[PDB]
Amino acid sequence: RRVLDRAARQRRINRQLEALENDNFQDDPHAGRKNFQALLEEQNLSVAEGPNYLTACAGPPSRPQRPFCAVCGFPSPYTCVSCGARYCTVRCLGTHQETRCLKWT
Amino acid sequence: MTTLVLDNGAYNAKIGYSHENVSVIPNCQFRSKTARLKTFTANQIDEIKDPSGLFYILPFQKGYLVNWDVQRQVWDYLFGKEMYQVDFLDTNIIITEPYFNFTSIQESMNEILFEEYQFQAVLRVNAGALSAHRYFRDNPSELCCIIVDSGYSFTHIVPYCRSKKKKEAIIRINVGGKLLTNHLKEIISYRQLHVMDETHVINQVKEDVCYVSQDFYRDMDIAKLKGEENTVMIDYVLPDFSTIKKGFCKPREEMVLSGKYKSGEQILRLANERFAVPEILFNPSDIGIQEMGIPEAIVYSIQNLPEEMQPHFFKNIVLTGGNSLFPGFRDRVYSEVRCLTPTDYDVSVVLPENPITYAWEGGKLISENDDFEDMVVTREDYEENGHSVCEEKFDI
Amino acid sequence: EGEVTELTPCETTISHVIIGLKTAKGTKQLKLDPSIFESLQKERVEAGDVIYIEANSGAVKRQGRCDTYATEFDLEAEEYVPLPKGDVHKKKEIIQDVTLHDLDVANARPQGGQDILSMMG
Amino acid sequence: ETEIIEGEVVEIQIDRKVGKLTLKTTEMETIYDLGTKMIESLTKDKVQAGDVITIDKATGKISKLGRSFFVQCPDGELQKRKEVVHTVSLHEIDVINSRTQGFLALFSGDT
Amino acid sequence: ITPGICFSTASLVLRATDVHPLQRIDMGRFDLIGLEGRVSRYEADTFLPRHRLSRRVLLEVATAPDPPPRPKPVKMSPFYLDSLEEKRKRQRSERLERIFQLSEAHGALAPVYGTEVLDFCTLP
Ligand SMILES: Nc1ncnc2c1ncn2[C@@H]1O[C@H](COP(=O)(O)OP(=O)(O)OP(O)(O)=S)[C@@H](O)[C@H]1O
Ligand SMILES: [Mg+2]
Ligand SMILES: [Zn+2]
Numbered sequence: 001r002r003v004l005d006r007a008a009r010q011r012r013i014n015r016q017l018e019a020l021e022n023d024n025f026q027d028d029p030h031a032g033r034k035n036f037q038a039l040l041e042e043q044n045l046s047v048a049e050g051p052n053y054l055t056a057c058a059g060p061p062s063r064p065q066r067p068f069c070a071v072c073g074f075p076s077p078y079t080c081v082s083c084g085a086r087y088c089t090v091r092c093l094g095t096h097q098e099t100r101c102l103k104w105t
Numbered sequence: 106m107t108t109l110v111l112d113n114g115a116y117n118a119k120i121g122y123s124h125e126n127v128s129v130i131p132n133c134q135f136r137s138k139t140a141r142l143k144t145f146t147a148n149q150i151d152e153i154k155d156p157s158g159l160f161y162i163l164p165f166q167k168g169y170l171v172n173w174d175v176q177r178q179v180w181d182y183l184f185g186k187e188m189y190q191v192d193f194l195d196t197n198i199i200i201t202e203p204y205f206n207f208t209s210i211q212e213s214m215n216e217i218l219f220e221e222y223q224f225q226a227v228l229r230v231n232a233g234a235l236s237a238h239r240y241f242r243d244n245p246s247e248l249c250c251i252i253v254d255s256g257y258s259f260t261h262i263v264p265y266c267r268s269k270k271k272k273e274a275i276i277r278i279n280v281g282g283k284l285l286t287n288h289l290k291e292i293i294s295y296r297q298l299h300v301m302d303e304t305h306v307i308n309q310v311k312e313d314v315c316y317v318s319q320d321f322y323r324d325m326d327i328a329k330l331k332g333e334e335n336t337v338m339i340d341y342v343l344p345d346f347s348t349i350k351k352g353f354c355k356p357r358e359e360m361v362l363s364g365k366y367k368s369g370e371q372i373l374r375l376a377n378e379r380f381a382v383p384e385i386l387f388n389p390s391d392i393g394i395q396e397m398g399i400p401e402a403i404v405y406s407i408q409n410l411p412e413e414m415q416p417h418f419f420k421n422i423v424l425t426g427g428n429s430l431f432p433g434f435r436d437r438v439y440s441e442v443r444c445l446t447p448t449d450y451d452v453s454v455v456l457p458e459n460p461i462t463y464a465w466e467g468g469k470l471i472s473e474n475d476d477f478e479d480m481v482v483t484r485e486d487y488e489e490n491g492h493s494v495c496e497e498k499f500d501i
Numbered sequence: 502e503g504e505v506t507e508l509t510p511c512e513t514t515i516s517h518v519i520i521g522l523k524t525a526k527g528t529k530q531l532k533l534d535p536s537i538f539e540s541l542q543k544e545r546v547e548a549g550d551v552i553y554i555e556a557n558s559g560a561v562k563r564q565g566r567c568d569t570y571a572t573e574f575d576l577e578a579e580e581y582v583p584l585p586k587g588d589v590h591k592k593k594e595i596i597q598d599v600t601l602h603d604l605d606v607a608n609a610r611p612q613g614g615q616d617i618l619s620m621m622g
Numbered sequence: 623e624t625e626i627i628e629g630e631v632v633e634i635q636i637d638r639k640v641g642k643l644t645l646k647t648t649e650m651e652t653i654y655d656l657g658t659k660m661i662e663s664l665t666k667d668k669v670q671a672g673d674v675i676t677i678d679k680a681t682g683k684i685s686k687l688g689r690s691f692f693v694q695c696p697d698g699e700l701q702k703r704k705e706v707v708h709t710v711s712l713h714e715i716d717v718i719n720s721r722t723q724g725f726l727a728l729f730s731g732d733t
Numbered sequence: 734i735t736p737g738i739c740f741s742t743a744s745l746v747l748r749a750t751d752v753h754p755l756q757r758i759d760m761g762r763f764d765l766i767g768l769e770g771r772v773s774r775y776e777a778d779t780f781l782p783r784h785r786l787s788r789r790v791l792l793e794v795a796t797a798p799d800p801p802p803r804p805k806p807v808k809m810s811p812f813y814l815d816s817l818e819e820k821r822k823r824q825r826s827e828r829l830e831r832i833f834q835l836s837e838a839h840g841a842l843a844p845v846y847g848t849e850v851l852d853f854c855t856l857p
């Protein structure tokens with residue numbers, strides 16, 4: 001099978017995490033000003049220049065990350081070779097391969 | 106004469122007068138497919154009858170005010186003839202700001218409040234400052250406190266001295282109710298049924314069924330079982346808005362293991378999502394956020410501070426915000442902090458009766474004080490000295 | 502007894518060893534006699550391991566790794582142990598019966614000893 | 623109860639320590655991130671791609687039961703929780719606890 | 734060449750003789766054979782009876798400030814808590830008592846023979 005490089009895995013993780021901050025998943029039912037990144041780039045905020053928004057971000061946790069199954073959520077001993085997603089059983093692996101492995105359906 | 110207290114949160118606006126009670130009103134506009142040309146503003150969401158597929162127009166992105174038009178409309182509705190009938194020229198306003206608010210947003214706040222409404226005086230503070238003031242009023246013997254504000258868009262942990270905020274030790278965790286609700290939607294959509302357009306219903310589901318587990322892996326093992334022994338599993342009937350107005354959980358005696366019901370109710374079965382979703386607050390890395398959780402961040406913020414003050418901070422942990430209403434939140438925070446705190450230092454975690462309205466009560470208390478007039482910035486002083494002195498007096 | 506959160510020998514040779522032990526009831530910082538550092542190094546004690554130290558003898562037993570670190574690797578040959586529940590410092594007053602033969606046989610042969618003759622014994 | 627990992631080795635990577643191990647059954651395939659002790663155990667007992675091995679997770683006890691391309695590759699789940707029952711005689715307990723490496727006396731007399 | 738015999742036993746069997754420290758007494762107070770080749774008659778008979786620590790000396794040294802630095806060679810309270818400090822001084826007292834009791838226990842036994850006797854009696 002195919003294998004996804006680190007850039008693809010990081011892009012998928014970043015895209016999934018950013019989607020959790022979306023206001024709505026659908027479009028405007030009416031169908032017919034800045035953003036956070038514009039505010040940050042306008043603030044010209046530099047690290048170590050006293051307490052600010054960037055320096056207030058929480059650091060990495062000491063306790064290691066705990067793996068959970070990407071399909072059912074229960075703990076997952078197994079890691080998918082192709083995309084690096086975690087899974088816990090043959091049924092869950094089949095569901096992951098059919099749904100979100102490689103092409104993101 | 107009168108004083109208006111406003112907590113301009115990204116999800117709920119705690120607006121009220123100093124001499125009256127507190128009201129919780131959503132601080133965002135709404136659009137629905139049941140209305141062709143109609144945008145609901147603030148508490149008008151009560152008028153709609155089919156909140157399924159509701160569209161949210163928010164004035165806050167990632168917890169900071171970024172959309173000014175919708176915020177202006179919401180404020181005009183709240184200050185209009187229908188809600189509060191605010192006499193701007195003879196009213197003082199206490200309005201809260203996000204932590205580390207950007208300079209541009211502060212300038213826009215000052216300009217709008219002092220020119221578009223022309224308030225008599227404005228006091229812009231942080232919700233944590235009001236919570237700390239209320240806590241110190243309740244406990245006069247305490248010299249320090251640490252405030253956990255687990256809100257809609259983030260969770261800050263800010264330590265407060267008697268009359269000063271420790272800006273060095275502020276730690277933000279980028280997990281809030283918005284993230285938890287979106288994650289629950291994504292889980293339910295991937296596992297059982299597509300609910301990504303049901304933000305309102307999924308939010309109610311999270312508020313009704315989710316809880317914080319004292320033993321995570323014991324609960325996972327219990328949820329993995331099948332039959333009577335699976336006490337965690339419950340059946341939730343989503344509201345169809347035809348005969349079931351609001352969602353509810355089926356009683357355990359009425360639960361059917363097979364999952365098929367003769368009545369055509371759309372039943373959503375949740376077993377491990379009950380505590381997996383709240384766990385993101387304590388373990389952000391569960392979903393993929395490489396950030397320390399609430400207890401570790403509390404300990405880190407305290408331990409950055411000098412040694413003499415640490416035991417006082419450990420004795421006055423205060424939980425504020427909506428996310429603090431999860432069952433088991435207080436006990437879990439206490440257990441984890443106790444595990445991490447030195448044995449010689451006593452740990453006390455306090456969860457108020459209404460963590461939503463804590464900041465509003467603090468604002469009312471600070472309004473009633475005889476030092477209130479010195480804190481505010483007047484419009485007459487705004488004309489000449491205002492734009493600098495607004496930054497100078499307010500400790501944002 | 503507890504999970505090791507810090508293991509720092511203080512140089513003058515080593516004047517003392519500062520150790521940090523964690524339990525469910527808190528964290529304690531201990532100053533150890535420098536002779537215990539050899540025992541800690543022999544037992545292969547690192548941060549995250551659950552150990553106990555005898556106050557009177559300096560004996561160290563590393564009874565596995567803490568189960569909070571069980572997910573740090575997907576496959577390690579480690580024994581993961583729960584974090585101890587009580588206090589780090591545990592005191593117990595005990596009454597134990599021994600016979601004179603036990604004391605006789607304890608002194609018949611030497612115990613330990615890093616010499617070659619002792620090891621071969 | 624013990625956790626037993628039985629499968630066919632696909633790829634083993636060790637770098638100067640960190641390592642990865644890829645194991646497959648006839649129904650699933652997985653990549654493992656290895657710890658230092660399991661890396662040492664796999665280095666001591668030469669394990670290469672194609673070998674069918676079983677691992678006791680808690681001990682690193684690796685026993686090679688053949689090669690596959692001879693024993694057929696295992697079918698079901700790679701990681702299995704097994705219940706192992708031992709019936710141990712009092713004499714065996716006494717001999718094992720009589721001295722260090724005392725279990726050897728169970729085979730050579732010398733008790 | 735044959736593979737070895739893999740003898741499998743219950744994990745509980747390997748802990749049969751193990752006793753938790755809180756459940757067993759210190760057997761080093763009866764260790765006579767361990768003193769041979771390490772402890773001398775001088776230490777047991779002449780030195781220790783004269784230079785044993787006392788609780789008073791230990792407390793005086795612990796409470797006294799740090800000694801002045803050794804001279805170089807010459808070629809010739811708002812945050813104060815009363816309960817925390819009471820706990821800390823109780824801990825210090827317990828630590829000093831433990832140090833005293835252990836120092837007395839670790840030098841209580843005298844060798845049967847001693848290093849001097851063995852050296853005198855040991856021919857080349
Ligand atoms: N009973 C409840 N159980 C769980 N979550 C709840 C409950 N009630 C409210 N919430 C959550 O509380 C959050 C809103 O809390 P608030 O702190 O009032 O938000 P906000 O303060 O207006 O926004 P911020 O964070 O201050 S910018 C939402 O994400 C709700 O889902
Ligand atoms: Mg708020
Ligand atoms: Zn699964």
Ligand SMILES: [Zn+2]
Binds near residue numbers: 084
């Ligand atoms: Zn995959």
